[PDB]
């Protein structure tokens, strides 16, 4: 029951930022992340 499907791509998760003239978001905790990068030399 697998088959090739074709679709208009979704670009990512759609969002609306909780903006207002007197609202801020400040982070109480943080993640330390390590990302690989690969380059030709």
């Amino acid at each position: 029951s697998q088959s090739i499907i074709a679709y208009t791509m979704s670009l990512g998760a759609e969002n609306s930022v909780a903006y207002s003239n007197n609202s801020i978001a400040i982070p109480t905790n943080f993640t330390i992340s390590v990302t690989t990068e690969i380059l030709p030399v």
Binding site: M9, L11, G12, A13, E14, N15, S16, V17, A18, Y19, S20, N21, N22, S23, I24, A25, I26, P27
Partner: protein, 328 residues
């Protein structure tokens, strides 16, 4: 990006001739490599496009209330009322460049191109999807500052973000607030001067237009080489075959292969080299997006001339435009 192209090499040299194809085989895989090298070019136009615009993983939308402290993004935010959800300034930029086709359904230079196996291919991301990534990049900036680049999006009042901005250029945050109506009016006046400029002048987009102009001209040159003799008795392939016998054709056809095949290797060299010019321009544009649009840059003259506050991206045919906002 530049225009995607592909070239049915066997159609270009040998348009509907079984003979010319059988003789083209005598040079082994020369067409194969040309197909592979234009393929290498064409893949990397979508890489170039995706690196410049997909610098976010969320499609941020502005709130419907424009409570931004006087700054008037209505000229760079989406117009909902147009099907292309581009900005005011984008709809100027898309008028200024007049593309000779993009692959929008053929069912003139480009009739000749099609009949010689030369085809313009459609880009992976449509001008609407590019406008959407651009809308997200901008809508994040005016609601979330630099934080939407560096991690999860964090809201902040726009006038508060601009205070931190002013700290970024070595100016103390009271200086903004004690002049906020002025700073809004100057920004609004400046956005107005970009409109009044781009609407009026016929010389602005020369940087993009010259890329497009060469893509058109190189295809037109590669068409026009089919009219050469190369010392054969005709440039028309069938005027050889319908005049001469098998043995006598092979001289004339080998002359046309000797010409046409060099005509493709020349073009695919030019295209490759050109592609290295554009790959650098795209890698730069993605860098400016990262540091000027997702950030604020302490690099001098990197984000336009002056002490950098912020940048807004806008899309254009085969390109991007940066509205760089600066304190002078």
């Amino acid at each position: 990006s530049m225009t995607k192209t592909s070239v049915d090499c066997t159609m270009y040299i040998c348009g509907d001739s079984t003979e010319c194809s059988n003789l083209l085989l005598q040079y082994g895989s020369f067409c194969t490599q040309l197909n592979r090298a234009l393929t290498g070019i064409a893949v990397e136009q979508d890489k170039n496009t995706q690196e410049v615009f997909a610098q976010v993983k969320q499609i941020y939308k502005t709130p419907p209330i424009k409570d931004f402290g006087g700054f008037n993004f209505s000229q760079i935010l989406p117009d909902p009322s147009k099907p292309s959800k581009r900005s005011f300034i984008e709809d100027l930029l898309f008028n200024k460049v007049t593309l000779a086709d993009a692959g929008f359904i053929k069912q003139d230079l480009i009739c000749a191109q099609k009949f010689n196996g030369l085809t313009v291919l459609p880009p992976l991301l449509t001008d609407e999807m590019i406008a959407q990534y651009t809308s997200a990049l901008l809508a994040g900036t005016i609601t979330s500052g630099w934080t939407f680049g560096a991690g999860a999006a964090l809201q902040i009042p726009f006038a508060m973000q601009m205070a931190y901005r002013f700290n970024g250029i070595g100016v103390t945050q009271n200086v903004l607030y004690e002049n906020q109506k002025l700073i809004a009016n100057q920004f609004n006046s400046a956005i107005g001067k970009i409109q009044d400029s781009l609407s009026s002048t016929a010389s602005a987009l020369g940087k993009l237009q010259n890329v497009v102009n060469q893509n058109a001209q190189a295809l037109n040159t590669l068409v026009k080489q089919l009219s050469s003799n190369f010392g054969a008795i005709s440039s028309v392939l069938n005027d050889i075959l319908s005049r001469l016998d098998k043995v006598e054709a092979e001289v004339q056809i080998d002359r046309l292969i000797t010409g046409r095949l060099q005509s493709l290797q020349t073009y695919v060299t030019q295209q490759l080299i050109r592609a290295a010019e554009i790959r650098a321009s795209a890698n730069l544009a993605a860098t400016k997006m990262s540091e000027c649009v997702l950030g604020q840059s302490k690099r001098v003259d990197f984000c336009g001339k002056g002490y950098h506050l912020m940048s807004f991206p806008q899309s254009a045919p085969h390109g991007v435009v940066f509205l760089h906002v600066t304190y002078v």
